[PDB]
Symmetry: C2
Subunit: 180 residues, 2 copies
């Protein structure tokens, strides 16, 4: 209810459609010129952001202290505009929630919002071969083309949708300390 | 905001996924055993409703008094369950609204809600060759597979999404007197 209202404003102010050599993704700007994509978007030196060519200054594929994968790439973008700082909507640890909204913004899915219900800290997961941590889980007739989707509840940006098995979907938690 | 909350409850209680020989559609039950589909779904003596075979007793392709097309088929279904009566959420004439939500429920679009913004009484429209009346219009990066979608605002079921031109989308108004 209030979750949808938060989602729509957030997507309008901070999201974009991104095209890489590996597909089309929703991308969430976080602050300054830093954005986040699913790791498997494998952004190169340049991406297409909102049908518009944009240069990529830096790119960190995030991992935890064991080297385990977190399935997130942070990118610094060669653009003049700065993103509204949303680092205050990110938790410091994994957030479990009863009602969440998954928001998608690609050309295959232009401005769609999905009520996904219960979000649960799944923990570990083998994902496309790679073992992965800090996953959140929800019950989701998934499809491809939603990777990058932003998982939200009221006042909280919870994580980025990175995968699914046809029956459940998985978001990488978007944690505050990633963005110091 | 409240529009999303209304939409989600409505879809959960009264909508279904329908497959016909002509494609896959969202279908909205109205009361008793009467539902509505876009006309171009051309339902035959039997449809698949929620992956489940269902027999179709009667079917009216709606027209106005001049014979002009309204782009809606009403169907009576051979099932024991009755739909919750939502005829009170239907207006008696075309409703214009500032914020509407378009709700889709197919396998290509499982439980998606789209904020479509301004809904305007378009009036007449040539649609797939056919001249058509009582259309509502909103600005919509459309795609196919959303025909049947239910257009709503808070407390109001406005119409059924029947078409689009790539840039705008069009709903047939769902008017009370269709259901006497």
């Amino acid at each position: 209810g209030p979750a949808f209202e938060f989602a729509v404003a957030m997507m309008k102010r901070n999201s974009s459609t991104v095209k890489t050599e590996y597909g089309e993704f929703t991308m969430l700007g976080i602050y300054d010129r830093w954005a986040v994509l699913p790791r498997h978007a494998k952004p190169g030196p340049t991406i297409l952001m909102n049908d518009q060519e944009v240069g990529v200054l830096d790119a960190k594929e995030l991992v935890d202290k064991d080297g385990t994968n977190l399935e997130l790439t942070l990118l610094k973008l060669n653009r003049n505009e700065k993103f509204r700082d949303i680092r205050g909507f990110l938790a410091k640890e994994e957030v479990e929630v009863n009602e969440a909204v998954l928001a998608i913004n690609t050309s295959k899915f232009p401005n769609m919002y999905i009520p996904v219900g219960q979000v649960t800290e799944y923990g570990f997961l083998n994902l496309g071969g790679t073992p992965t941590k800090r996953m959140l889980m929800y019950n989701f007739p998934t499809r491809a083309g939603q990777a990058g989707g932003v998982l939200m509840s009221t006042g909280k940006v919870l994580g980025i949708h990175v995968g699914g098995n046809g029956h459940q979907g998985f978001s990488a938690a978007l944690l505050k300390h990633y963005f110091n």
